[PDB]
Structures are given as structure tokens and as C-alpha cells.
Amino acid sequence: SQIGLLLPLSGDGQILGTTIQSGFNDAKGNSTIPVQVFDTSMNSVQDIIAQAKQAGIKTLVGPLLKQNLDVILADPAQIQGMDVLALNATPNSRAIPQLCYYGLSPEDEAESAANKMWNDGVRNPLVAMPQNDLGQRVGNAFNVRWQQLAGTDANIRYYNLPADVTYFVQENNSNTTALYAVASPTELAEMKGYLTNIVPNLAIYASSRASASATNTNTDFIAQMNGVQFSDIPFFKDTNSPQYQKLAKSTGGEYQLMRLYAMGADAWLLINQFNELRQVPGYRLSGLTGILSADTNCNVERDMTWYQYQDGAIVPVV
């Protein structure tokens, strides 16, 4: 009947919220469902939920920022009687009825990498995570999936400097055949250049963090990265259309903003199928940000698309 959209639309987070909102609104199109917008930078989450309720709103999309979600997680009773698609997640959170979580998380991408590598015949992968909390969380996501596929733990290591990854290879037996690395584009390029002298035929897999506008339009970078495969959203498969070109112009070519646009679009898709997502086992939706499904805690997971640097171009993997 009515939706409340909770996003940061001013202050810190404004570019995130306004870009998600654009995707959401473009997806919504000519919908007759009214959407009331609540700027989470100008009111507390608690007060917004009270406003929404008193307006007769029973369905929310958002909030986005971790600190905002923290409020709901600290007092989930305030959303009783509502359907809420939060736009954030935590690798280890609880089940709350009528709450689902939709983050574009790097954990999603790690799980996809485990699946991909396993299907490609990789065994004993080296998994190189940054030595920080995020690296720990993403590595754990990889490991849990690998345990399911392979029946054994993954070799998770934590780098401080890109050269550490070559140490990891040298410290292991002679049978490291593939690497999953989470790193910036240049870091990944630094890593790969060191590994050339050590394991020049290493199969390298990376996340979407390795794919950025500035480096992907650099010929030398693309050459350095030849053979590297990485995950990203399926939105980037076909970039020729006027609609894609117009979005690329509006975002200054920034992939991170286009991913947020796509997230908003998929939030519209998901909120309209909220009950189905919760109730139908093995439910899947084809979205701009991946093939979407829900785990037991109604955390939305994403099946990623794979891309590869190949002879001067970036091409979807067949």
C-alpha cells in the first residue's frame, strides 16, 4: 500500500543515499505505490519509524548506514507489524521476523569466488585478505563456503603489504595454484608483479574492488592484469546502451556510484517480492546486482558475474 524509504540524503552519506534513491525511483517508474522519503541525516531512526507508523506505513526500505541499523538491532520491537528491508548487513546477526537485509557486501563476493574457484577445479587456494576487521570478515565468508564445497578449510592469510602475498606462496609447499585476493586495483597489480618471478602461471581471482574506472582505462594496467578474473555486478555486462552511457556520464564514470544505483533498483525489486523472499525456499531473483536469494536469517545473498582482463580488454567470462 505505502513504502517509507530511509536513506541519508544530506550530510555524510548523501552521495550514497541520493544515488540509491535514483536507482530506486527509476525502477519504481510509474508505480501507484506511494513512497514517503525519510532523510536519516535529519531525523533519528527511532523518530522516523514513529512518523512512518503514524502515517500508516507498514513497509520500509532502509536504513543504510551501519549506525542506523544498530538502532533497530538494539530494539527490534519498534518495527513489529512492519516489513523492513534494511540496506545493510552483518556477517553474524540474528533472525528478526519481517526484517530482511540487503547489502552489497564483500562477503557476497567472497562466497562467489569460492564457488567459482571450486567449479574451475582449483584446490588448496591461497586466500589473501587485508589484515583488518573487514579482511577477517570476508576471509571467514570465503572459508565457510569453501568448507561446504571442499570439505576442508581454506588457506586464509592476512597481508599488510602486497609483497606479503609472495611470502605466503614461498612459505607453503610448491603447490599453490590459485589466489583469491581482496585489494585495491593498484595493490592487486603490485601483488601480481611480485608473483611473476615466483609463480608466473598463478590463477588470480579478485573482487570488484579490483575494478575501478581510473585503472580500467589505463592500457598498462590492463596489460599487467592480463588473466586476472574478478567478480562484479551483471549490470556491467552490456555498456553500449544510451541508458548506460547516460548513467556513466552522470556518475563521472565511477563504478562505485553505478553499483549503488543498481542497488537502489534491486531494492525496489526486492521490496515488492518481500513475502516471497521470506517464504519460498530456494527463491531467486535476477537483479542488476546479481542473482539474489535469501538465507535462513533473510540476509540477501548475491551470485556474482565474472569478468576477466584479456588481451587489452575486459570481457565477461564464458
Side-chain angles (χ1 to χ4, degrees):
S1 186
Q2 295 190 76
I3 294 162
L5 180 63
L6 278 62
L7 294 169
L9 293 172
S10 63
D12 195 352
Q14 171 175 5
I15 192 61
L16 312 174
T18 63
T19 306
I20 294 163
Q21 181 185 39
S22 187
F24 188 86
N25 281 344
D26 287 356
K28 178 162 74 55
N30 201 34
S31 178
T32 63
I33 303 166
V35 175
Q36 184 169 346
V37 177
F38 301 94
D39 181 354
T40 54
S41 298
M42 292 217 290
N43 286 118
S44 70
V45 172
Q46 191 193 351
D47 197 67
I48 287 165
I49 296 178
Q51 288 186 46
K53 284 174 168 177
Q54 289 178 30
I57 294 168
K58 290 177 179 34
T59 302
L60 305 178
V61 174
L64 180 67
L65 303 185
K66 198 166 62 58
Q67 57 263 43
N68 295 155
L69 183 53
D70 287 341
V71 169
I72 292 166
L73 293 180
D75 177 28
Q78 59 190 312
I79 55 168
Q80 272 168 207
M82 314 180 86
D83 286 345
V84 177
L85 182 66
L87 293 177
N88 193 282
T90 304
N92 295 61
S93 300
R94 57 181 201 272
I96 290 154
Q98 289 181 298
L99 186 56
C100 297
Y101 313 90
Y102 173 50
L104 308 164
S105 72
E107 290 80 2
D108 302 332
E109 298 200 52
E111 289 164 344
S112 282
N115 296 337
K116 176 75 165 75
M117 294 171 88
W118 174 263
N119 290 341
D120 290 344
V122 170
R123 305 295 184 257
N124 312 300
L126 171 62
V127 178
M129 301 290 98
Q131 190 180 319
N132 57 35
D133 288 353
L134 187 46
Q136 184 288 143
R137 290 191 297 267
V138 175
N140 170 250
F142 188 100
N143 187 234
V144 174
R145 185 61 53 91
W146 195 259
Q147 290 178 149
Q148 294 171 356
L149 294 170
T152 189
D153 268 34
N155 177 206
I156 310 318
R157 298 293 302 275
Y158 302 104
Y159 68 86
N160 288 299
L161 292 163
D164 302 348
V165 180
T166 75
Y167 303 165
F168 304 159
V169 174
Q170 294 176 73
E171 293 170 339
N172 185 347
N173 289 337
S174 253
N175 321 1
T176 292
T177 58
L179 167 67
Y180 182 53
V182 166
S184 72
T186 52
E187 293 184 293
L188 191 46
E190 296 162 346
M191 281 176 197
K192 182 179 161 176
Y194 297 129
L195 288 161
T196 306
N197 168 76
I198 294 144
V199 279
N201 302 265
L202 186 68
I204 299 170
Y205 300 74
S207 73
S208 63
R209 179 165 165 181
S211 186
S213 179
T215 31
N216 275 2
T217 55
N218 186 285
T219 300
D220 285 12
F221 180 84
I222 291 168
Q224 285 182 48
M225 292 289 279
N226 193 55
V228 170
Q229 302 182 43
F230 64 94
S231 52
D232 213 336
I233 61 170
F235 187 74
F236 291 126
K237 282 175 65 193
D238 298 322
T239 60
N240 288 331
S241 74
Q243 295 87 350
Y244 182 88
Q245 290 191 54
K246 187 173 170 183
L247 177 70
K249 193 174 173 221
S250 63
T251 56
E254 292 176 43
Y255 300 168
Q256 293 182 237
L257 299 185
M258 286 191 269
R259 294 179 189 116
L260 288 164
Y261 177 89
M263 183 189 185
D266 281 4
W268 174 257
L269 182 67
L270 286 162
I271 195 62
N272 278 278
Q273 309 308 323
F274 191 89
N275 291 330
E276 290 82 1
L277 186 66
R278 292 196 55 92
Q279 292 165 192
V280 180
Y283 199 74
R284 294 180 68 79
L285 290 165
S286 183
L288 297 191
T289 66
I291 307 296
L292 313 172
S293 62
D295 77 5
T296 51
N297 304 329
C298 208
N299 186 54
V300 171
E301 297 186 29
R302 305 182 290 148
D303 179 359
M304 309 299 294
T305 297
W306 286 82
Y307 301 90
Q308 187 171 35
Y309 297 91
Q310 182 173 43
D311 303 328
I314 301 173
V315 306
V317 168
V318 178

